[PDB]
Amino acid sequence: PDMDTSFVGLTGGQIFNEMMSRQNVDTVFGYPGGAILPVYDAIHNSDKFNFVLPKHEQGAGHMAEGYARASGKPGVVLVTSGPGATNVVTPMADAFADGIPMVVFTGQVPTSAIGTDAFQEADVVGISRSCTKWNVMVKSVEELPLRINEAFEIATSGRPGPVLVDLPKDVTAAILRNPIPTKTTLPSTSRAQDEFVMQSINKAADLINLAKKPVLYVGAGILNHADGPRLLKELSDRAQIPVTTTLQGLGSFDQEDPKSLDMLGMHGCATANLAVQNADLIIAVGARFDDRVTGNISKFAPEARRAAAEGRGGIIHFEVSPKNINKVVQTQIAVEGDATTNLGKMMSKIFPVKERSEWFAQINKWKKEYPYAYMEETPGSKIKPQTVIKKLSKVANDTGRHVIVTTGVGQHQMWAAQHWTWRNPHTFITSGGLGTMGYGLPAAIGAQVAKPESLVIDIDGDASFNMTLTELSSAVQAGTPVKILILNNEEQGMVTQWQSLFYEHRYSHTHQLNPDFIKLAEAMGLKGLRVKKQEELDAKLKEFVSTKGPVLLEVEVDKKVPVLPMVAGGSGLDEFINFDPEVERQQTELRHKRTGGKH
Amino acid sequence: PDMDTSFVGLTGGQIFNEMMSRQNVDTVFGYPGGAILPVYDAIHNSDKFNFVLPKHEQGAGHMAEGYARASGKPGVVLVTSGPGATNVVTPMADAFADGIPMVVFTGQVPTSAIGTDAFQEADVVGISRSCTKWNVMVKSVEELPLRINEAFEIATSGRPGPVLVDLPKDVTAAILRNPIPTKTTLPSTSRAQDEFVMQSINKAADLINLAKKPVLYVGAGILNHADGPRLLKELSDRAQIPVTTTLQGLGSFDQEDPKSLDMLGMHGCATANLAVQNADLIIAVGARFDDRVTGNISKFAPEARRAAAEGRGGIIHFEVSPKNINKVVQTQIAVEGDATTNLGKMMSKIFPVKERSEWFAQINKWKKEYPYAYMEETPGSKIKPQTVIKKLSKVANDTGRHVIVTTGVGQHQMWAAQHWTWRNPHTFITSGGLGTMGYGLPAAIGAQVAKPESLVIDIDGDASFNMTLTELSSAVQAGTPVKILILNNEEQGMVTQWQSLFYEHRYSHTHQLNPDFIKLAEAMGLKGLRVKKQEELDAKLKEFVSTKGPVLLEVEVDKKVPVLPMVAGGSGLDEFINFDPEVERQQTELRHKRTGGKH
Numbered sequence A, B: 001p002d003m004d005t006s007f008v009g010l011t012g013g014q015i016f017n018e019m020m021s022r023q024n025v026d027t028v029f030g031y032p033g034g035a036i037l038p039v040y041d042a043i044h045n046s047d048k049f050n051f052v053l054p055k056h057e058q059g060a061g062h063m064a065e066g067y068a069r070a071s072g073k074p075g076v077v078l079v080t081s082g083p084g085a086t087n088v089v090t091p092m093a094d095a096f097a098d099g100i101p102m103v104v105f106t107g108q109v110p111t112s113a114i115g116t117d118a119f120q121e122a123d124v125v126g127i128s129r130s131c132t133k134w135n136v137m138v139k140s141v142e143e144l145p146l147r148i149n150e151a152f153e154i155a156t157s158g159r160p161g162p163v164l165v166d167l168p169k170d171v172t173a174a175i176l177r178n179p180i181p182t183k184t185t186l187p188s189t190s191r192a193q194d195e196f197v198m199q200s201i202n203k204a205a206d207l208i209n210l211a212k213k214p215v216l217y218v219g220a221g222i223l224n225h226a227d228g229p230r231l232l233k234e235l236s237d238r239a240q241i242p243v244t245t246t247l248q249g250l251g252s253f254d255q256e257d258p259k260s261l262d263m264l265g266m267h268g269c270a271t272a273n274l275a276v277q278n279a280d281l282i283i284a285v286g287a288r289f290d291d292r293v294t295g296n297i298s299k300f301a302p303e304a305r306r307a308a309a310e311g312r313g314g315i316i317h318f319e320v321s322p323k324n325i326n327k328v329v330q331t332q333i334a335v336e337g338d339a340t341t342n343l344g345k346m347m348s349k350i351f352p353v354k355e356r357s358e359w360f361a362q363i364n365k366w367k368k369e370y371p372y373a374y375m376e377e378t379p380g381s382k383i384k385p386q387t388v389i390k391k392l393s394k395v396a397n398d399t400g401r402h403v404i405v406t407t408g409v410g411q412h413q414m415w416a417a418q419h420w421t422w423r424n425p426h427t428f429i430t431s432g433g434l435g436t437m438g439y440g441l442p443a444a445i446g447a448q449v450a451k452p453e454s455l456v457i458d459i460d461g462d463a464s465f466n467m468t469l470t471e472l473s474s475a476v477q478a479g480t481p482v483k484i485l486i487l488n489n490e491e492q493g494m495v496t497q498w499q500s501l502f503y504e505h506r507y508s509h510t511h512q513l514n515p516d517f518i519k520l521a522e523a524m525g526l527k528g529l530r531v532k533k534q535e536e537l538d539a540k541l542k543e544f545v546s547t548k549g550p551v552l553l554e555v556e557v558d559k560k561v562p563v564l565p566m567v568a569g570g571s572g573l574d575e576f577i578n579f580d581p582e583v584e585r586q587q588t589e590l591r592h593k594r595t596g597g598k599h
């Protein structure tokens, strides 16, 4: 092979530093330690990238995830061996579940100490095998550029995801003394395959042109291409097809559009769920038919199943990964590869549709029958969490600024999903597949680093926020003016919801003792605001959003409020529990009796 | 025939509750979630044990470790699937490295959903394989009692360690219909081997009786038996053998005893290191010759190696785990099994030594010329961190209470180890093998739960404390009046030491921005105290330990103060860097010069 000598004489650490600029890395999230010292010495004062220092490595990981979701670039993490590495397992597993591109670099003990139960040695490659797309231990400095290039390529192609690169201390401290192949130092289709994909596209167009009640079921995959939302909208307009998104597709479709069905699934709106259950054709675009979406699989999409049996519909799946094709539902047509690219190729084959009067009339009736109803504020009552989301959504949107929302995990997360009006791609950043509490704050910090001009709001739960609240001071140190909203119901609400519904109001260890959030914000160097009274909510939300610098707003909200609608257990998507104020009142009395007045 | 029907009609969750009682568990540390709901329902209002709720599952893990180190009982952790499980990887790796008995129960998605990339599904058995002695996924409720009994047995036998038991939701929700073998529901050596051990004991006695300059090298293994320290003291008195301990053996030997050599190793005292390098016989008791202890292995113990070649000494190893014998160093005699048990069998074969005048004269000369020296306070100077430990040591002892000390990781940890006078077993609880920053606070909480009557002090670093400071509120909820001391040098001191020494004072990302610790303590519901002035120190320390409830004391200490002595790099144990006041003053000028005054 051709040889490259440009790195000869540099340490592994210096080569790392150089590769970052070559991989277009502008930001690194990390925390130093012994094993990774030679790399830290090499990036000392580097103007190649901004370095962000969290208080805990899990924070670096979630920051990198938020950065990635906001920027479209891989999040880069740099931590030490042992506990440095084990502390990023959660964010890696999280990134793997949600398809987030991340490259995690972990220091490792010298190669000669590996396998001796050495100081701060973990089998990181073993530990992270099942929660990365790929991982590797670099065994020589000669190998370092190759592994870095492979890592970035793997993380950002196919379905994006995390990769881990283990860096032994002797490798990063070693000087490169051999020339290395030029192929290894530079970053970065079958004809029958292309023709096959084009065939599948022709068939997909044929099926779509045949459908009388189609639904577009859209997920995160459409957001992995700049033109995704635009092409989705063009197809929806051209063929008059209503659009529902998963939790992770929120923002990919303008919810102000009359063809918007909002979110489907366990806590999706009834209209989206009913449309899916009655559709003759489901066009799945960058979504993986997760169990939180389909409800009971045997009851899922009966009209599409009927249509398939009669050769006049079923399910079309635009999917980039073979692992996810036919994994859950039998698929009539799989269109393999990037969804956006394939929609573009399909477009001209779709017959323009004048109208779908009957289908849209039915959908509009469902919209009138089943809004996201809930128990609203009454005199003397506590503030309702759903109301907070609705008001903040309007206040934030009215600034005219680009707005990005992150969340923790639980009821507040579902209410954010439901009651915010989603209009822009890459503006909702939430932990869906793994559902990691504590995601909200560091993800917001990372997102703010990616988009310094954006209004970044973490809509968080009190228990979620406790998980990673130490990163408040990191936000100040990083100069990220994040807006932290805590919907404080003094409970792990999502868990108490399940305990209310399925365990006869037995609240087993679901009430953590919260700190004073306002004094905490002040201790951490932020402005802290609290609202308790209905009458002050509007003014406080405006002050919150208008504040220059990072700010925390705690809203005391009502407790034991269920997220509805809800599809759970053996229920099909059309068998949801709906909001009913009389039932809520009865369940409240029942709860007080069963808990002996404790809750 | 011998089938048991007492669990018939119980859910797996309810069986779990009963099994905790049979295993004499009095405390469970955990955090609930969806997959583990059936177990939480079953333990709701349980009178079998107390439950401790942290803010983060890593907190649960470290609390359980602290609880285990202080009580001698396995720490039990109960968390949910997915992120709940991945959040306990660090404590498991930590407990694995330090040999701490822990049984981790993780909820898992239903067996039907396993392997489908389900909601909150992680491959927990795969992930935790390298950091547990043993793990298992329970596949039927019939199998549940068996796996629980196996878990506890493995965790507490041989070298103690963490085990993981994965609990699918359908298994814990399932009702046992079938009788199960009675033996599976009840908790819990060849005479050839016994003779072989006896043979080794005989040979080891002869070698000891022959030694002229013997050293007892004592580790954590001696603390795994109630009679350990007693038998250690007996052997030391009888054969007049000086005793040095590892970091993890601290407290096993009375440091007030004239035969104490204090701690050996990288930051051990000079006398201990010199004694080890000049010994003709090293008697290793429950210690694994870690790289932080031996220094450059090829320079380690030359006098014992010399003696081994002439058949007049060498190394004796009392080790419970066969894989840790002849793992680091060539051993003349290995005594397999429990160290304490084997010391008891050996004692009567040891010849009582009158005196070792020459050996102890040499040792006492070293003690006089190489004490733990450091730069002491001067008028107008900042408080020295070594001085705080010394004073706190005395103030804590004067309370008359049983004192337990935990720490974070870094310089403060080494200073705690060096400058405290250790006299009682199971009173120093620190992360040694993995070295996990953030260990200090949750370990203290766990220790306080184990020993409600003890004075528990977390001597912590500012950076370490930031890692897990959210658990402050958990301490209040748990009713544990821990005393938290922060030696605040506004730096990752241990890392800056290495950067000062080996990287020409290039401080790459080792200065994190701290919150106001006093305001933080108050927000968290604790009393907060601060000391800046030398004159205030004694009074504040006294107020600190005299405070009834939980309390945080921040002491502002001098920065860029190295931990000495220090053995690093290619250095042997006798080639340590020692303290010198003029060199320190020179280092200060050099540092100021190189940092432009910033550090």
Ligand SMILES: Cc1cc2nc3c(=O)[nH]c(=O)nc-3n(C[C@H](O)[C@H](O)[C@H](O)COP(=O)(O)OP(=O)(O)OC[C@H]3O[C@@H](n4cnc5c(N)ncnc54)[C@H](O)[C@@H]3O)c2cc1C
Pocket: A097, A098, A099, A158, A159, A160, A218, A219, A220, A221, A222, A224, A225, A245, A246, A247, A248, A249, A263, A264, A265, A266, A267, A268, A285, A286, A287, A288, A289, A290, A292, A293, A318, A319, A320, A321, A324, A337, A338, A339, A340, A409, A410, A413, A414, A431, A432, A433, A434, A435, A494, B119
């Ligand atoms: C408390 C809670 C409640 C929840 N309830 C709901 C709910 O009610 N409704 C809901 O929808 N979700 C819900 N979830 C989230 C759910 O668990 C999943 O995370 C989510 O549904 C996954 O959405 P997705 O399929 O669009 O994204 P992903 O999981 O990221 O899947 C994307 C799919 O598109 C593919 N893909 C990626 N890139 C491309 C590309 N360039 N071209 C083509 N294909 C591509 C991927 O391979 C993958 O198959 C909930 C989560 C939590 C924590």
Ligand SMILES: Cc1cc2nc3c(=O)[nH]c(=O)nc-3n(C[C@H](O)[C@H](O)[C@H](O)COP(=O)(O)OP(=O)(O)OC[C@H]3O[C@@H](n4cnc5c(N)ncnc54)[C@H](O)[C@@H]3O)c2cc1C
Pocket: A119, B097, B098, B099, B158, B159, B160, B218, B219, B220, B221, B222, B224, B225, B245, B246, B247, B248, B249, B263, B264, B265, B266, B267, B268, B285, B286, B287, B288, B289, B290, B292, B293, B318, B319, B320, B321, B324, B337, B338, B339, B340, B409, B410, B413, B414, B431, B432, B433, B434, B435, B494
């Ligand atoms: C910043 C830092 C600095 C450090 N510097 C030092 C230092 O200067 N000096 C030092 O000593 N440590 C130091 N360490 C700690 C070091 O890394 C190890 O954790 C420590 O040396 C291990 O001590 P140990 O061998 O006694 O315990 P362990 O690691 O737990 O090993 C105990 C051995 O005894 C065996 N054993 C267990 N139970 C029994 C039994 N019942 N019978 C017989 N055998 C048994 C075990 O199998 C094992 O082989 C440092 C750590 C940090 C974070």
Ligand SMILES: COC(=O)c1ccccc1CS(=O)(=O)NC(=O)Nc1nc(OC)cc(OC)n1
Pocket: A033, A034, A035, A081, A108, A109, A110, A113, A118, A119, A120, A169, B266, B291, B292, B494, B495, B498, B569
């Ligand atoms: C981090 O451990 C190692 O990389 C390691 C492990 C096993 C064998 C050899 C090494 C390399 S090392 O002996 O030179 N130590 C090192 O690189 N860093 C180092 N940093 C400290 O504080 C930052 C403290 C400290 O020991 C307590 N070691």
Ligand SMILES: COC(=O)c1ccccc1CS(=O)(=O)NC(=O)Nc1nc(OC)cc(OC)n1
Pocket: A266, A291, A292, A494, A495, A498, A569, B033, B034, B035, B081, B108, B109, B110, B113, B118, B119, B120, B169
């Ligand atoms: C934890 O996930 C499951 O155990 C699981 C995963 C895949 C398939 C089936 C299940 C069981 S389940 O559908 O009945 N859900 C469940 O047990 N808990 C549950 N808890 C929530 O918050 C407490 C929220 C929530 O979905 C958002 N699911």
Ligand SMILES: Cc1ncc(C[n+]2csc(CCOP(=O)(O)OP(=O)(O)O)c2C)c(N)n1
Pocket: A408, A409, A410, A411, A412, A413, A435, A436, A437, A460, A461, A462, A463, A464, A465, A487, A489, A491, A492, A493, A494, A495, B031, B032, B033, B034, B080, B083, B084, B087
């Ligand atoms: C790390 C982690 N631990 C446990 C869970 C299980 N869990 C899911 S939602 C939830 C409660 C969240 O409470 P909160 O953050 O306050 O949001 P709320 O539902 O009250 O709005 C819990 C404990 C989880 N998702 N992640």
Ligand SMILES: Cc1ncc(C[n+]2csc(CCOP(=O)(O)OP(=O)(O)O)c2C)c(N)n1
Pocket: A031, A032, A033, A034, A057, A080, A083, A084, A087, B408, B409, B410, B411, B412, B413, B435, B436, B437, B460, B461, B462, B463, B464, B465, B487, B489, B491, B492, B493, B494, B495
């Ligand atoms: C989780 C984790 N991350 C990183 C490290 C690397 N590390 C070891 S000691 C140290 C500095 C600790 O600073 P501090 O807690 O303030 O103690 P100090 O040395 O200043 O007394 C670091 C960053 C570690 N041991 N653990």
Ligand SMILES: [Mg+2]
Pocket: A255, A262, A417, A418, A419, A420, A421, A422
């Ligand atoms: Mg909406």
Ligand SMILES: [Mg+2]
Pocket: A410, A461, A462, A463, A487, A488, A489, A490, A491, A492, A493
């Ligand atoms: Mg809550």
Ligand SMILES: [Mg+2]
Pocket: B255, B262, B417, B418, B419, B420, B421, B422
């Ligand atoms: Mg001492």
Ligand SMILES: [Mg+2]
Pocket: B410, B461, B462, B463, B487, B488, B489, B490, B491, B492, B493
């Ligand atoms: Mg410090």
